[PDB]
Amino acid sequence: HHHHLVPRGSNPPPPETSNPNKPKRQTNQLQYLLRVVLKTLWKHQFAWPFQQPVDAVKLNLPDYYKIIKTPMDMGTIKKRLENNYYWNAQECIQDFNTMFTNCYIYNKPGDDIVLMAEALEKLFLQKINELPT
Numbered sequence: 479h480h481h482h483l484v485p486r487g488s489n490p491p492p493p494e495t496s497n498p499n500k501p502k503r504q505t506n507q508l509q510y511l512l513r514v515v516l517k518t519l520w521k522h523q524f525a526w527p528f529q530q531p532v533d534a535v536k537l538n539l540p541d542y543y544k545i546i547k548t549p550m551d552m553g554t555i556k557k558r559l560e561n562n563y564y565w566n567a568q569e570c571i572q573d574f575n576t577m578f579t580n581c582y583i584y585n586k587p588g589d590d591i592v593l594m595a596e597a598l599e600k601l602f603l604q605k606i607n608e609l610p611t
């Protein structure tokens with residue numbers, strides 16, 4: 479709206495969460511990623527800002543998508559795991575890493591959201607360290 483004084487930043491469509499063209503392939507590592515890693519992060523007191531795609535309009539981050547080219551969030555990851563979108567653990571780990579990276583490159587060091595990301599990432603990496611073979 480020309481009426482706006484403060485810029486608004488529009489949102490992309492959210493990331494895809496299923497892929498009709500891949501077989502339904504379950505592994506112990508993917509089960510662990512959903513049921514141990516994602517679940518432990520999801521229930522953490524700092525998870526809530528990470529649980530859905532960044533809404534740059536509702537959160538007043540009008541420059542978010544200028545800075546972040548590959549958005550990712552734990553809601554998308556959770557859905558991708560539940561839908562068997564991933565071929566392997568590495569692909570899921572990549573999406574968690576993207577989510578954390580986005581936070582670290584958009585927000586200033588020391589920002590509260592960065593401190594939250596750091597606590598979550600520590601837990602994530604602890605859990606990853608115990609990935610079943």
Ligand SMILES: CCN1C(=O)Cc2cc(NS(=O)(=O)C3CCCCC3)ccc21
Pocket residue numbers: 527528532537580581584585590591
């Ligand atoms: C994690 C995604 N993210 C950012 O990178 C910056 C940001 C800001 C907010 N805004 S918010 O929910 O009003 C709250 C989030 C906790 C820090 C203070 C601001 C939510 C998510 C994100």
